[PDB]
């Protein structure tokens, strides 16, 4: 049973239930075998009718094409960043300040 990697729109797999998708929310996605975490937003870019999901310099699925609705989406990661704690001193006080 020979197989080939995801270089084309997928045809044959199991009968997994396809639920409705949501937009502008922190939701996991599973688009034709690839999974990731992020939000789904409408994009103003262009995808030639033959074009599959795009890629970037860092080789990540920045944009995907819906096989059902034939719609335009982007993948962007969640709101993350470093946290800074301001400690005036252990002997001075226990109050701290949280900086994002």
């Amino acid at each position: 049973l020979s197989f080939e990697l995801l270089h084309a729109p997928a045809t044959v797999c199991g009968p997994k239930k396809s639920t409705n998708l949501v937009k502008n929310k922190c939701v996991n996605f599973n688009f034709n075998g690839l999974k990731g975490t992020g939000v789904l937003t409408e994009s103003n870019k262009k995808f030639l009718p033959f074009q599959q999901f795009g890629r970037d310099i860092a080789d990540t699925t920045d944009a995907v094409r819906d096989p059902q609705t034939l719609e335009i989406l982007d993948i962007t990661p969640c709101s993350f960043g470093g946290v800074s704690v301001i400690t005036p001193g252990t002997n001075t006080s226990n109050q701290v300040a949280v900086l994002y």
Partner: peptide, 29 residues
Amino acid sequence: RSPIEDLLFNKVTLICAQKFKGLTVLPPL
């Protein structure tokens, strides 16, 4: 800034892709 400095800052020159992949640039103090 002085007009000489106004010429100086104008002679010295995506960040979102680097910001997404764990690379952050702290602003100068």
